[PDB]
Structure formats: C-alpha cells, structure tokens
Design a protein around this ligand. Structure first.
Ligand SMILES: [O-]S(O)(O)c1ccc(-c2c3nc(c(-c4ccc(S([O-])(O)O)cc4)c4ccc([nH]4)c(-c4ccc(S([O-])(O)O)cc4)c4nc(c(-c5ccc(S([O-])(O)O)cc5)c5ccc2[nH]5)C=C4)C=C3)cc1
Ligand SMILES: [O-]S(O)(O)c1ccc(-c2c3nc(c(-c4ccc(S([O-])(O)O)cc4)c4ccc([nH]4)c(-c4ccc(S([O-])(O)O)cc4)c4nc(c(-c5ccc(S([O-])(O)O)cc5)c5ccc2[nH]5)C=C4)C=C3)cc1
Ligand SMILES: [O-]S(O)(O)c1ccc(-c2c3nc(c(-c4ccc(S([O-])(O)O)cc4)c4ccc([nH]4)c(-c4ccc(S([O-])(O)O)cc4)c4nc(c(-c5ccc(S([O-])(O)O)cc5)c5ccc2[nH]5)C=C4)C=C3)cc1
Ligand SMILES: [O-]S(O)(O)c1ccc(-c2c3nc(c(-c4ccc(S([O-])(O)O)cc4)c4ccc([nH]4)c(-c4ccc(S([O-])(O)O)cc4)c4nc(c(-c5ccc(S([O-])(O)O)cc5)c5ccc2[nH]5)C=C4)C=C3)cc1
Ligand SMILES: [O-]S(O)(O)c1ccc(-c2c3nc(c(-c4ccc(S([O-])(O)O)cc4)c4ccc([nH]4)c(-c4ccc(S([O-])(O)O)cc4)c4nc(c(-c5ccc(S([O-])(O)O)cc5)c5ccc2[nH]5)C=C4)C=C3)cc1
Ligand SMILES: [O-]S(O)(O)c1ccc(-c2c3nc(c(-c4ccc(S([O-])(O)O)cc4)c4ccc([nH]4)c(-c4ccc(S([O-])(O)O)cc4)c4nc(c(-c5ccc(S([O-])(O)O)cc5)c5ccc2[nH]5)C=C4)C=C3)cc1
Ligand SMILES: [O-]S(O)(O)c1ccc(-c2c3nc(c(-c4ccc(S([O-])(O)O)cc4)c4ccc([nH]4)c(-c4ccc(S([O-])(O)O)cc4)c4nc(c(-c5ccc(S([O-])(O)O)cc5)c5ccc2[nH]5)C=C4)C=C3)cc1
Ligand SMILES: [O-]S(O)(O)c1ccc(-c2c3nc(c(-c4ccc(S([O-])(O)O)cc4)c4ccc([nH]4)c(-c4ccc(S([O-])(O)O)cc4)c4nc(c(-c5ccc(S([O-])(O)O)cc5)c5ccc2[nH]5)C=C4)C=C3)cc1
Ligand SMILES: [O-]S(O)(O)c1ccc(-c2c3nc(c(-c4ccc(S([O-])(O)O)cc4)c4ccc([nH]4)c(-c4ccc(S([O-])(O)O)cc4)c4nc(c(-c5ccc(S([O-])(O)O)cc5)c5ccc2[nH]5)C=C4)C=C3)cc1
Ligand SMILES: [Ca+2]
Ligand SMILES: [Ca+2]
Ligand SMILES: [Ca+2]
Ligand SMILES: [Ca+2]
Ligand SMILES: [Mn+2]
Ligand SMILES: [Mn+2]
Ligand SMILES: [Mn+2]
Ligand SMILES: [Mn+2]
Lengths: 232, 232, 232, 232
C-alpha cells in the first residue's frame, strides 16, 4: 500500500520537511512557537512540506491516518488567552490567510470565517461572530471557523496536551481524543468525506492566530503522522 | 469527572490489578502468553481486576476511552496459526467460556459463537462456521464471534503490533487503528451503543484460544487504558 | 534528532512522494521500469520528491543513512545488456542529463562522463571510454562515471537483487552489500565526504540508461531509506 | 565462492546449529534469554555451532559478511539495567569467560577486561573500570571490553532493536547500523583486520552478563547471517 509516515520530537529551521508560513518562530529547544506576541493580528502556520495524496481519482479510495501531537498554550500578563491552535488539512496550494485583528480566524479563514480546509480546533476564546460556544472548546471545522460540531473543553495555561487523531477510510470518521494534564480525556468525532471537500493532494499542518487584545504562546512540542492509501 | 487510567509496560503474576482466567502464563520477561501450546482447545484471558462503570443510569451518560496496546503472534512448526487475540468488554461477572476444540471462539463465546460481550478481534484463521472472511482480519464483535464488521488485515509472525482504540461517548463510535511492522496502518470503525449492550459495570481485557490443529503463541506486551465518565 | 524515513514495496504514478524524469514507466504490478526498450539512448530516473538535508552548515554534522533496495535486469533477444542501474545522490536541483547514444552515462553525466553527484553503480557493460573494468562491476562514483573504486560483480538476467547500503556520519564511510540470487554476497566500501561533494540539500534516487546497441529492462522492485541527522 | 548463510526467526533447544554456553534459556516463544535474573554474576552466550573460516592462509583473502539481528532489553523493578548484549567473533575453541560480579565483562573477558575476540557491543551501564563513556553506548571491541571506538546510544526498555552489520573484505571496514524504536538510526564503523586478530576458523554469536546489583532481561529475537569467501 501507499504509506506516508514522519515523526518530529523536536524542530529546527532549515529542515526541508517543514514549511513555515507567518509568525512561526522555532525556539532554541526544538519547540515551535506559532504566534508573535508583539504584533496585532499575528498569524502563523507550520506545514509538512510534501503534499500527501489522500485519495485516488482512479481507485476511488481514501486514505486513513493516525496522527498524534502535543502542544502547550501559556498565558501572558494583561492579555486575553487567544486564539488557540488548529490542526488542519488544505489544498496543496494553501496560502496563509490574511492576518485579521480583533478576529479569531485561527489563521485559516477570511474575516467572515470562510476558507477551504478541514481541521480540528482547540479554541480558547469565544467570538459571537463565529458562533463560538460560551467557553473553551474543541471543534471540527469544515471550510468554516464556525465549527460543524463542538464539545466543551478546558484549556490550562502551561499544560502539555497530548492529542491522538484517527481517520477511518471507509466510515469516513474523523475521531479526536484530547488528553489533559490531570488525566481526563475529551473526545469528539465526525464524518467528513475527505474525498468531497479536499482535492487529491492536500497538506497537513498546525495553524494559529492572535488579536489586538487576545494573545498567548502557542507551542507545538511534537508531531507524529501516518497515513495509508490502499491502491489495488 | 470520573476517570480510570492504568498502564502496563510489563506484567507479573501476583499483581492484584490483573485477573488471570485460563491458560494464561506470565513470562519471565514481563510478557503475557495467553494460550497453552500443549493443549487441545487452550483458552486464556487477562482482565483488569476492577470493574469500570462505563455508563450511569443516573446521568444517562456514557464514558469515552482511549486505550492502546501491543501484541505479538509467533507461529510454531507444524501448526495452523490460530485463533488470534481479542480485546473485549464484558459484564463484571464474566466467566471464561467453555474451552472448545477445532473451534475458534477466541475464548469469549459458546460453540455456536454467541456470548455477552463487545470486542475488537485480531483473527488469523477462517472458520466457515462463523462467517470468517477468506483471510486474516480485524473485526468488531457484538455478542457474537461472527463480526458485525470486518476489514482485511494481515498477521505477521514474530511482529510486534501497536493498536490504538478510541471510543466517543456521544457519537458512540468505536475506532481502531492497527499499526503493522512495516509501517502501514489498518483502521476500522463502528457504532456500538455501549449503554445498550453492556451493564453499567463491565471489565476490560484480552482473550485468546486455540484448537486441536490450530495453535500459536499469543503475546500481550503492553497495555495502557484511560476512560472518563462525565457526571454533572 | 532529525530523521527521514520512507518505504516503498510497490510504486504507482501519481504518488507525490516520487518524481519521474525520463523514460520511467510504472508497471501494472507496482514495479518501476527505468528505460524504454524502443528508443536509442533511452534514459530514466526516479527520485524521492522531497530534498533531504544531509548536513548542516550550522552543526557541521553529516547524517548517516541506511537504505536497502531490490532490482532486476532481464535481457532482451538480440541486444547487449546495458547500461545498468545506479543509486545516487545529487543537488536538489538535479536535471536529467542529456540522453546520449552508444554511450553509457547511466543517466547522470555528460558525454564525457562528468556530472555533479555521488552514487553506487551496478554496471553491466564495459566502455573503454570511461575505464570500465573488463566485466560486470559494482562501483562508487563521485562526480564521474569513471568509478573511484570498483569490485568484480556478475549480473544475472531475471534475478532479483537485494542491496543494503550504510553510511557512517563520522567515518564518512559508504558501505554497500550486494546479495545475489544464489546467496553469495558482494561488498565494496569507500570514504566520501558527503559534506565536501554535495550541497546541504540533495535528492536520493535510481537512474539508468541505454544505447543504440545496448538495451535491457531495469526494474526497481522496492526501496526503503532512513537517514538521521544529529543536531544539538 | 565459499559462502555460509543461515537464518533464525525463532529458536528452540536441541537445534544442533546452536551451542548454548552459560545461563542461556530459550523461551516458549522462540526467543533467546541470555542471562539468569536470580543469579549474581549471571553469564550467557549463544553461538552458531559450526566454525566459519573467515580467511585463508592460502588465498590471503578475507571473507565479507552481512549479518542483521534484533534484540530487546527490558528492565526489572529495583535493579540497575546491565550489562548489555554483544555480538562477537572468537577463536573456534572459545570457552565461556569466568562469571564475574559487580563487573561488566559482557561475558567475553576476564576481570581485567582482556580477552581474545572482536565484537560490537550494546552497553547500557558505565564502569569507570573499563573506560565506559558516561552513558549508554554502542562500541567496537577488539580483545578488550574497553571499546576501541564508541558512539552515544540510548537503550529503551521493552523496545525491539534491529541491527545491520556489514564487513568489507578489502577495506577491512566493520560497519554497524542500529535502528531504534522511534525510527532514528545510530551508526559506527571501524577498520579491524580480521586476519590480524582472529585465527582462520572463528565462531559467531551473542553474549551477555549481569552483576550483583545490575540485571535485566537480554533477548535475542532473530538472527540472519551471510559470509562469502572468495577463493580462486
Ligand atoms: O521586548 S521586551 O524587551 O519586552 C522582551 C520581550 C520578551 C523577552 C523574552 C522573555 N522570556 C521570558 C521568560 C519568563 C519571564 C518572566 C516570568 S515571571 O517571573 O513569572 O514574570 C516567567 C517566564 C522565560 C522563561 C523561560 C524562558 N523564557 C526560556 C527557556 C524555557 C525552557 C528551557 S529548557 O530547555 O531548559 O526547558 C530553556 C529556556 C527561553 N527564552 C528564550 C528566548 C530566546 C533567546 C535567543 C533565541 S535565538 O537567538 O534565536 O537562539 C531564541 C529565543 C527569549 C528571547 C526573548 C525572551 N526570551 C529562549 C528560551 C520573558 C520574556 C525579552 C524581552
Ligand atoms: O508588547 S508588550 O510590552 O506588552 C510585551 C508583550 C509580550 C512580551 C513577552 C512575554 N512573555 C511572557 C511570559 C510570561 C511571564 C510571566 C507570567 S506570570 O508569572 O504567570 O505572570 C506568564 C507568562 C513567558 C513565559 C514563557 C515565555 N514567555 C516563553 C517560553 C516559551 C517556551 C518555553 S518551553 O519550556 O516550553 O520551551 C518556556 C518559556 C517565551 N517568550 C518568548 C518571546 C520571543 C522572543 C524572541 C522571538 S524572536 O523574534 O524569534 O527573536 C520570538 C518570541 C517573547 C516575546 C515577547 C514576550 N515573549 C519566547 C519564549 C510575558 C510576556 C513582553 C512584552
Ligand atoms: O487590517 S487589520 O484589521 O488587521 C489592522 C492592521 C493594522 C492596524 C494598526 C494598529 N495599530 C495599533 C496600535 C494599538 C492601539 C491600541 C492598543 S490598546 O488600546 O492598548 O489595546 C494597542 C495597540 C498602535 C499604538 C501605537 C501605534 N499603533 C503607532 C504609534 C507608535 C509609536 C508612536 S510614538 O511616536 O509616540 O512613539 C506613535 C504612534 C503607529 N501605528 C502606525 C501605523 C502606520 C500608519 C501610517 C503608515 S504610512 O502610510 O506608511 O505613513 C504606516 C503605518 C499603523 C497601520 C496599521 C496599524 N497601525 C504608525 C504608528 C493597533 C492596530 C489595525 C488593524
Ligand atoms: O429540585 S431540588 O433542588 O430539590 C433537587 C433534588 C435532587 C437532585 C438530585 C440529586 N442527586 C444527588 C446525589 C448526591 C451527590 C453528592 C452527595 S454528597 O455526599 O453530599 O457530596 C450526596 C448525594 C446522588 C448520588 C448518587 C445519585 N445521586 C444517583 C446514583 C445512585 C446509585 C448509583 S450506582 O451506580 O451505585 O448504582 C449511581 C448514581 C442517582 N441520582 C439520580 C437522579 C435521577 C435522574 C433521572 C431519573 S429518570 O427521569 O427516571 O430517568 C431518575 C432519577 C436524580 C434526580 C435528581 C437528583 N438525582 C439517579 C441516580 C444530589 C442531588 C437535584 C435537585
Ligand atoms: O430550582 S432550581 O432551578 O434553583 C434548581 C434545582 C436543582 C438543580 C440540580 C442540582 N444538582 C446538584 C448536584 C450537587 C452538586 C454539588 C454538590 S457539593 O459537592 O456538595 O457542592 C452537591 C450537589 C448534583 C450532584 C450530582 C448530581 N447532581 C447528579 C448525579 C448523580 C449521580 C451521578 S453518577 O454518574 O455518579 O452516577 C452523576 C450525577 C444528577 N443531577 C441530576 C439532575 C437531573 C437531570 C435530568 C433529569 S431528566 O432529564 O428529567 O431525567 C432529571 C434529573 C438535576 C436536575 C436539577 C439538578 N440536578 C441528574 C443526576 C445541585 C443542584 C438545579 C437548579
Ligand atoms: O524494436 S524491436 O523489434 O527489436 C523490439 C525491441 C524490444 C521489444 C520488447 C521485448 N521484451 C522482451 C522480453 C523478453 C523475451 C524473451 C526472453 S528469452 O526467454 O531470454 O528469450 C527474455 C526477455 C521481456 C521480458 C519481460 C518483459 N519483456 C517485460 C516485463 C518486465 C518485468 C516484469 S515483472 O513481473 O518482473 O515486473 C514482467 C514483464 C516488459 N516488456 C515491456 C515493454 C513495454 C511495453 C509498453 C510500454 S508503454 O508504452 O510505456 O506502456 C513500456 C514498455 C516492451 C516494449 C518492447 C519490448 N518490451 C514491459 C514489460 C523481448 C523483447 C520488442 C521488439
Ligand atoms: O520510411 S521508413 O519506414 O522506411 C523509415 C526510414 C528511416 C527511419 C529512421 C531510422 N533511424 C534509425 C536509426 C538506427 C537504428 C538501428 C541501427 S543498427 O545498429 O544498424 O541496428 C542503425 C540506425 C537511428 C539511430 C540513431 C538515430 N537513428 C538518430 C540519433 C543519433 C544520435 C543521437 S544523440 O544526440 O543521442 O547522439 C540521437 C538520435 C536519429 N534519427 C533521426 C531521424 C530524424 C528526425 C527528424 C528529422 S526532421 O524532420 O528534419 O526534423 C530528420 C531526421 C530519423 C527519421 C527517420 C529515421 N530516423 C534523428 C536522429 C533507423 C531508421 C525510420 C523509418
Ligand atoms: O579438488 S581438486 O582435486 O580439483 C583440487 C583443487 C585444488 C587443489 C589445490 C591446488 N593448489 C595448486 C597450486 C599450483 C600448483 C602448480 C602450479 S605450476 O607448476 O606453476 O603449474 C601452480 C600453482 C598452488 C601454488 C601455491 C599454492 N597452491 C599454495 C601457496 C600459495 C602461496 C604461498 S606463499 O608462501 O607465497 O604465500 C604458499 C603456498 C597453497 N595451496 C593451499 C591449499 C590449502 C591447504 C590447506 C588449507 S586449510 O585446510 O585451510 O589449512 C587451505 C588451503 C590448497 C588446497 C587445495 C589446493 N591448494 C595453501 C597454500 C594447484 C592446485 C588441489 C586439488
Ligand atoms: O579441477 S580443475 O582441473 O578444474 C582445477 C582448476 C584450477 C586449479 C588451480 C590452478 N592454479 C594454477 C596456477 C598457474 C600455474 C602455471 C601457470 S603457467 O606456467 O604460466 O602456464 C599459470 C597459472 C597458479 C599460479 C599461481 C597460483 N596458481 C596461486 C598463487 C598466487 C599468488 C602467489 S604469491 O604469494 O606469490 O603472490 C602464490 C601462488 C594460487 N592458487 C591457489 C588455489 C587455492 C588454494 C586454496 C584456496 S582456499 O580454499 O581458500 O584455501 C583457494 C585457492 C588454487 C585452487 C585451484 C588452483 N589454484 C592459491 C594460490 C593453475 C591451476 C587446479 C585444478
Ligand atoms: Ca475563537
Ligand atoms: Ca477465527
Ligand atoms: Ca557502462
Ligand atoms: Ca559495561
Ligand atoms: Mn470555535
Ligand atoms: Mn472472525
Ligand atoms: Mn563503470
Ligand atoms: Mn563499554
């Protein structure tokens, strides 16, 4: 079968395996910082350089993937914790959205909240403008920052989070599982025909954003991904 | 929230956290061997000692869980590789099924293939008697060794397999992801109202079985489980 | 550490992980055929799409890699068996050399035999023009098809060959091991400062070529590569 | 040519192809356990029964060999992980060294650390007594447990390791490549005139050792070897 599999326990600029779009800054400790704290409307994304072919117009098949990653969002004195991180899939040609300001497009949509991508969001700030549930949540976005489905979650400053994602090729089920510091697990799941929303070749990555009054650190500590596309 | 979480990177008899039913033998290397190679109809199960309350007749809620484990099945000269391992959930009072012989009840059902449990099987031998697909497969059993759903898989002797399982409380979606030695991933998913098939208190574990002509080693190398039941 | 690792047990056009330059044709059986039999001066290469950073101008370090692959070269009635296959490393910008004719540039050099690359060759036809030893050989090329070192080898039509390559980061030692059909092993080794001949970002692949009178099938059946670059 | 080639994916006592010296115990799962956990100064070796003639006093030639193997070292509650495994070559008459105690002779040398053999070690415990680098390492021993060369490595409990070794007949270059669980590869290489340190007929095998305070399980899961001696 056709399989893609990489693994990052640390990061460093110059690695041809990763493309940095935006205010992404790599720390001297192999950690990725997605947003710039001294900017209004900061926006940053990190992408796996090579396009992965998720489905075949020939086979009709759609790949399954098992990806897990860890992150951390520490608060900063006199600032609203926002906007949150986001793990997403987009067309190989994906450009980084327009930086916006009070806004919270998580770096994947326009001022309105539209965009061509599919992703899991770890949102920590409500925006009446995009239907943001009253509090912190994990969502499943499909071409819109107005999550298709959402589940109550709670973000804890300085806490390392572990996230395991599974996608079933057949059942077209995207299933997330958020492991918190204390132990408790948060989970959400949703059907998303990857073959219906995304072109054959897409790209995987993490994106973030901030506002004029909303800022915080967004750290991607590690990432491991594996996808297999049956073809025969 | 109410959360259960344990982790085994090795095993050893005498640990009050685990109950051994059957031909289960713990190796001098912290590995669990489920079946006896010198017996006809061997049968062995390993269970997590404490019952876990998966759902509340009060809350109406159902717990989500994230469990991952690793195993190995090595062949033995002049023998049919069978019957395979099985990760399952049963009523807290679960007794070990009647050993059977040519059979392949995987240690959780009667000669007919019936039984009260829900599990994911890693079957390596077809039995016209239970609708076993032509070849090796991973299935989703619900009170029957005649899998509700199955997906083509391939068992490799002496290979360590990693398995990550996720259950969503709401969507009632059981999602498995099998990682093979070469890298490729196999995934299957199914809806199973845990609150519909199982009593409030159940038990988690791994079971196995062998036949007169079918035998092999069944090793459970490691296991980590975590469930969280929202109650409020 | 920074590690790259992929694995191909079969191939298929359209996979974004591989670039096809030349007369490369993918068979309906997941096998790569490097040259066109009905052409004079056929030339074909297959490359791993992403550039791998072999050394760091910052760390001063150079990655080690373990790559193994298998191939087959079947003869064709009324034709001289040539030119042979070649596993090579080149600057990320590598274009496919000019097709040549009686020649045997193995698809990586000019008419003269010069070129910017480093590779292991599995040559099956002698050319007084490039110092080709009297018979079939395995060589170690460094910017020239006139091998730096060579060892007697014997190519057998329709035989599948297994090749394991190891490169030591420190000792700068490139070590090959050719396993033939009958069992016997052929081995060659050579020091090559990868950091001295190649730019930071290079590409890995297999190349081939044919002549007016020299032609044969060149099949790359499988390929597995892994490189690790220590950085800290 | 003169070629030796065997392959073990499992083991079992009684096989005339293998000699067991020491506390070697074969598990009911085709796995070899090198040391006894309940002994002070345990020592165990496993050898390929037949002597292999590495070089000819006639030809002047030296054989090349390609051997790869896999092992596992799991820790045990309240014990220092030691001493490690070792793949070695010795004179056909090789007796198993004197068991020692606090010591870490890896079962191939005297209390002083001397001995007649050549091997690659996978050491997991430092001994000021033999120049052991601060931490876990892979070394190249030549008649002394005080490695000629060493490279930083990291041993992970319960992890299966794959090791590919290549020896070039001419360049007299012994090249190792350690593949860890996460993917990363560790490599080391050294020149060792086999014809200079060893007699014509030698034996290949794996050895281990433990101490009063240092103990752990040492498992040899598989082994495949092939050597070819050119003679003409
Ligand atoms: O514009 S301003 O003037 O306003 C201005 C704005 C911001 C900054 C800060 C800053 N760090 C702070 C804390 C902090 C402060 C106060 C409290 S408080 O007391 O509670 O208030 C709490 C926490 C803080 C805590 C821990 C760290 N910073 C660690 C760190 C963590 C973990 C490890 S580890 O590995 O050991 O785990 C190692 C290191 C690092 N910090 C850097 C780093 C850097 C250097 C070079 C390079 S580069 O050149 O690129 O290589 C890249 C990155 C910078 C550059 C600027 C900078 N840090 C690298 C590691 C607070 C402010 C300075 C001035
Ligand atoms: O404009 S203003 O004047 O308003 C203004 C706005 C923002 C800032 C701050 C700031 N950090 C703070 C904390 C903080 C302090 C006290 C508490 S409190 O005690 O709770 O109150 C809570 C939080 C804080 C805590 C931890 C960190 N900061 C860490 C850090 C990361 C990762 C790790 S670790 O261990 O995970 O690796 C460890 C530590 C980093 N911070 C940077 C960094 C940076 C430097 C250079 C570059 S570059 O361009 O690349 O050179 C890019 C990025 C900046 C730039 C500005 C900045 N940090 C890099 C790492 C508080 C304020 C200062 C002034
Ligand atoms: O499109 S978006 O919607 O995304 C969007 C994008 C960008 C912006 C902002 C912005 N500034 C903000 C503050 C701000 C306000 C309130 C708070 S808060 O209230 O605390 O929250 C915090 C921060 C803010 C505070 C101070 C300044 N801005 C100062 C400044 C600094 C120093 C001095 S000085 O001299 O006194 O030192 C004087 C003035 C300047 N700002 C510019 C400037 C500019 C002008 C002309 C030209 S040009 O045409 O080239 O000439 C080039 C550049 C722009 C252009 C855009 C822009 N500033 C020039 C000086 C907040 C947002 C808004 C929306
Ligand atoms: O309006 S008022 O304000 O007056 C008002 C009065 C009462 C309530 C409470 C309440 N339960 C409390 C405890 C409690 C918590 C902490 C302490 S503490 O010790 O002080 O801290 C002490 C006591 C508490 C503890 C255990 C239970 N409740 C269990 C239970 C028993 C057994 C098991 S098990 O697993 O063992 O079998 C599992 C769960 C149940 N509770 C219900 C239940 C119910 C739901 C739906 C249906 S139906 O519609 O039919 O579906 C039928 C019944 C209700 C409905 C209302 C209600 N419980 C069903 C099971 C405390 C308050 C709220 C508001
Ligand atoms: O009139 S007002 O508007 O003012 C008003 C009056 C009453 C209420 C409360 C209330 N519960 C409280 C506690 C509480 C919290 C902290 C402490 S403290 O720690 O002491 O502070 C003490 C007590 C509390 C603790 C535990 C429970 N409640 C549990 C419960 C039991 C068992 C389990 S489990 O899982 O363990 O089995 C899990 C959960 C349940 N509670 C319900 C339940 C219910 C839901 C649906 C249906 S229906 O759909 O109709 O069937 C029927 C019944 C209601 C409905 C109203 C209501 N509970 C069902 C289960 C405190 C207030 C709110 C507003
Ligand atoms: O100009 S002339 O008239 O002179 C002239 C010159 C050359 C040819 C031959 C030829 N093949 C021969 C053997 C052969 C015969 C007898 C013996 S004998 O026994 O020694 O006698 C030995 C060898 C031979 C053996 C095996 C193959 N050919 C295999 C093949 C490879 C690998 C596998 S497998 O399974 O291992 O992968 C399976 C099959 C293939 N051959 C093609 C192929 C092709 C087609 C379309 C496209 S495209 O257009 O791109 O679609 C691309 C490529 C062509 C095109 C021309 C051509 N093959 C594709 C696969 C002998 C002659 C004919 C006439
Ligand atoms: O009508 S019929 O059906 O009867 C019929 C009549 C003639 C032909 C042939 C033909 N070439 C042959 C060999 C050949 C094969 C085997 C042997 S054998 O050894 O004897 O067996 C001997 C010879 C042969 C060998 C090498 C070449 N041909 C090379 C060549 C050399 C070197 C290089 S290089 O650069 O790589 O060095 C690259 C390419 C070229 N051939 C042309 C070319 C051409 C293209 C465009 C234009 S134009 O219109 O002006 O644009 C003008 C000319 C034509 C046009 C027709 C034609 N070639 C251009 C380059 C054998 C027959 C086919 C059918
Ligand atoms: O199966 S068959 O029946 O077919 C059959 C097959 C092969 C043989 C031969 C053979 N040697 C020949 C010449 C030869 C003869 C005549 C002329 S002519 O007159 O010129 O024509 C030319 C050449 C020949 C010349 C020189 C040597 N042989 C030298 C030698 C080289 C270099 C030096 S030195 O000092 O210079 O280094 C010293 C000695 C040696 N030969 C051996 C040796 C051996 C012994 C023990 C062990 S072991 O068991 O491992 O201990 C391993 C190997 C064997 C084993 C078989 C064998 N030699 C060891 C050294 C001709 C045939 C006989 C029968
Ligand atoms: O059965 S068959 O009939 O088929 C048959 C086939 C082949 C043979 C021959 C043979 N050697 C010949 C000459 C020769 C003689 C005269 C002229 S002429 O007079 O010019 O015509 C031309 C050529 C010849 C000349 C020199 C040598 N042989 C030298 C040699 C090289 C270098 C030096 S040195 O030290 O000086 O450098 C010293 C000696 C050696 N030969 C061996 C050797 C061997 C031994 C053990 C081992 S092993 O198993 O590994 O131990 C491996 C190899 C064998 C085994 C068979 C064999 N040699 C080792 C060294 C002619 C025939 C006999 C029968
Ligand atoms: Ca938001
Ligand atoms: Ca079965
Ligand atoms: Ca040539
Ligand atoms: Ca030691
Ligand atoms: Mn949202
Ligand atoms: Mn079945
Ligand atoms: Mn050559
Ligand atoms: Mn040592």
């Amino acid at each position: 079968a056709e399989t893609v599999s990489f693994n990052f326990n640390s990061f460093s600029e110059g690695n041809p395996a990763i493309n940095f779009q935006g205010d992404v800054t790599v720390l001297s400790n192999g950690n990725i910082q997605l947003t710039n704290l001294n900017k209004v409307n900061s926006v940053g994304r990190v992408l796996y350089a090579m396009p992965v072919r998720i489905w075949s117009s020939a086979t009709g098949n759609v790949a399954s993937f098992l990806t897990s990653f860890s992150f951390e969002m520490k608060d900063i004195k006199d600032y609203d914790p926002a906007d949150g991180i986001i793990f997403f899939i987009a067309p190989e040609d994906t450009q980084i959205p327009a930086g916006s300001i009070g806004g919270g497009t998580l770096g994947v949509s326009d001022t309105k909240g539209a965009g061509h991508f599919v992703g899991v969001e770890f949102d920590t700030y409500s925006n009446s403008e995009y239907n943001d549930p009253p509090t912190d949540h994990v969502g499943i976005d499909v071409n819109s920052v107005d999550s298709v489905k959402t589940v109550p979650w709670n973000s804890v400053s300085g806490a390392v989070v572990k996230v395991t994602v599974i996608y079933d090729s057949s059942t077209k089920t995207l299933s997330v599982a958020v492991t918190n510091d204390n132990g408790d697990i948060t989970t959400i799941a949703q059907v998303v025909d990857l073959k219906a929303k995304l072109p054959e070749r897409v790209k995987f990555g993490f994106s973030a954003s901030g506002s004029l009054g909303g800022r915080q650190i967004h750290l991607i500590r590690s990432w491991s991904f594996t996808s297999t596309l049956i073809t025969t």
